[PDB]
Structure 1
Amino acid sequence: HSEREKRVSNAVEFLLDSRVRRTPTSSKVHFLKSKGLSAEEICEAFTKVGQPKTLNEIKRILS
């Protein structure tokens, strides 16, 4: 995997965890950015797990 793919893969695994799934979106977004994910990478991970968010929602959290 590329480093980007590893970031997204790690985010996917995170977002699937049952406790995580009960955490609000905002805190997960801020978490994922702290891990070094861009907004686009975060948006990709949310879509890969079937919890899709707009880019604009993600950028509003991060703003």
Structure 2
Amino acid sequence: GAMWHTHSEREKRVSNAVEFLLDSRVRRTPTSSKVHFLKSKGLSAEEICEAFTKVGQPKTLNEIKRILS
């Protein structure tokens, strides 16, 4: 309907991403693989960046954009 729920939808993407990044096997995959996965789930580059900072493994915004280019 008329309510897009943009904020809660963005929050769910980032929290799902944080949970992905913390998975035991996912942690032992390269940053590029993780970035590509999150992009395929509809995260923006900023949201990917935010998720990496939240798991204590900050990546610069430019690093994310380079992987996705």
Q: TM-score range by the shorter chain?
A: over 0.9
Structure 2, gaps ≥5 residues long: 1-6
Residue by residue over 1:33-53, the C-alpha shift from the partner in whole angstroms, topping out at 9 and shown as x without a partner, is 000000000000000000100
User: What is the rounded CA distance, in whole Å, between the counterparts of 1:13 and 1:53 in structure 2?
Assistant: 17
Alignment size in residue pairs: 63
Alignment match, 2:4: none
Greater than 2 Å deviation, 4+ residue runs = none
**Structure 2 length-normalised TM:** 0.89
Q: For 2:63, which of 34, 57, 63 is the aligned residue?
A: 57
Structure 1, gaps ≥5 residues long: none
Residue by residue over 1:1-47, the C-alpha shift from the partner in whole angstroms, topping out at 9 and shown as x without a partner, is 71000000000000001100000000100000000000000000000
- Percent identity, aligned pairs only, is 100
The CA RMSD measured in Å over matched residues stands at 0.9
